[PDB]
Amino acid sequence: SGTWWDEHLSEENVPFIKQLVSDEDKAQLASKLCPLKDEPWPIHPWEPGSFRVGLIALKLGMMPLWTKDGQKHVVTLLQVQDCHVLKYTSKENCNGKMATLSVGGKTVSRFRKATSILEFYRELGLPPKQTVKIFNITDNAAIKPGTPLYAAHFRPGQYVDVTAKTIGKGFQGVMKRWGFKTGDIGRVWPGTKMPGKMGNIYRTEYGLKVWRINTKHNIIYVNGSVPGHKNCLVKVKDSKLPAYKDLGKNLPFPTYFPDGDEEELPEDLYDENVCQPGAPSITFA
Amino acid sequence: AIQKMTRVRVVDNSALGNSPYHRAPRCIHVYKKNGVGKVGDQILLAIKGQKKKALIVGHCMPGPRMTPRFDSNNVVLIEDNGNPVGTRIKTPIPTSLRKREGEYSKVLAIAQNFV
């Protein structure tokens, strides 16, 4: 037989285990709030040509955002929920071209994971995240594994690339999937467009302007549309577009640290062109 | 969207418009790559057996928000060189003609009203 966690517990012991395990998840998330009062890794300044970490965010939904020129910009919200660095692998052990950081988001039940994963997070000292994405990264940006990543890792004005599974449409035919509808060739070429399973694949939207970040609720407000349904987990990295490869001067280079306590951030950073709520009604004079 | 074959309500003080005729004036060609015209496009137009260039001033399918939407396909005639046939335009004209690239300054001197 196979079991589940709840199977042999009495009526008395089920909310006891809920309060116990939930409280250890809150304590483990609370202990990691001081990365710099811990012993971090050596923080380097930004060098031209270095890459830093990305994030994993919920897609909250969309809302409009008017700029000072009186144009709408549809904006997805992306909440950062319990994002943390999980493992650093150098380039020598990776046998890739570059070092890698594994980062995971959205705490998920301990009662529903493989035991290799629970041993991993147990040794690491964290409640297990839903997704773990991997970031190609230079040696200069390498935060210690077990450190929180926040919304202000990105700043307004920055352009960003977001990857998520697209909304799966299940098995679709040619007209919806591909949008249409030789003799001597006695066969159908590979990559021919035929009916099949549409969606539920990873796609990346490239070069999306960050308009506004909300430091309190940890929201990123990104231009336009991101792949995936609502409440989906997206991987938010800095854009690879070569028109945007050098603007890492002003971005906090390892990551943003509220523990650093230096010139703390407001409620919500806005881009310069954003009409804030509470500003007087804009006139084009 | 004013495509081919659409009936067109000409708003002018022109001789061609306000003349009575057995056929309603209807579009023939739209001067975009796709054959769909919006507020501030040029079309060919059949009036009294005479094809004639024309400029779309407001249509019935909704555009962006703060812009107006008419209950007819109001169209102002124009000549080949670019100056309009008309002298007065009675029905209101959207200000969205101002930003678009093309001949619009000539028409905005003629409007009685602006919406």
Binding site: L9, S10, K169 | -
Partner: protein, 152 residues
């Protein structure tokens, strides 16, 4: 693609699914316990609890009496819904029904279910009990609860 489509499509149309569910709900107000196939039962379970929430709006309410007049095809059950079922559940705010699975139907092997209304005169169902608090694992966890209470 049926994302967020919440209703089973049943019977031979929307009208016919509402008449199937209305017959099941009438059966369950009358007999207070029903075997029926499973998908039909949980569709109708949604409707059943709402029907009591209209029963608590009072006999004298006009809207409640319209809903009861539609949903109960036998008209003698409308005094029952406003004087037996709605006074029974006047304390608790939800959870008026319980649904379990029967073994599959002998005829065509359909997934079967029972719903009853809670607190009826009928012999009780063999409800799935949790394991006893005096078992080995439950006593280890009881001891652990005693230690974490001893922390204060």
């Amino acid at each position: 693609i049926s994302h967020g489509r919440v209703f089973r499509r049943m019977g031979l149309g929307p009208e016919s699914r509402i008449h199937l569910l209305r017959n099941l709900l009438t059966g369950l107000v009358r007999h207070e316990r029903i075997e029926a196939p499973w998908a039909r039962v949980d569709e109708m379970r949604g409707y059943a609890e709402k029907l009591i929430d209209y029963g608590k709006l009072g006999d004298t309410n006009e809207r409640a009496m319209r809903m009861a007049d539609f949903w109960l095809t036998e008209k003698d059950l409308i005094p029952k819904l406003f004087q037996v079922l709605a006074p029974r559940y006047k304390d608790q705010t939800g959870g008026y029904t319980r649904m379990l699975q029967i073994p599959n139907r002998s005829l065509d092997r359909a997934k079967m279910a029972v719903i009853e209304y809670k607190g009826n005169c009928l012999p009780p169902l063999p409800l799935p009990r949790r394991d006893s608090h005096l078992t080995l694992l439950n006593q280890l966890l009881q001891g652990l609860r005693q230690d974490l209470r001893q922390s204060q």
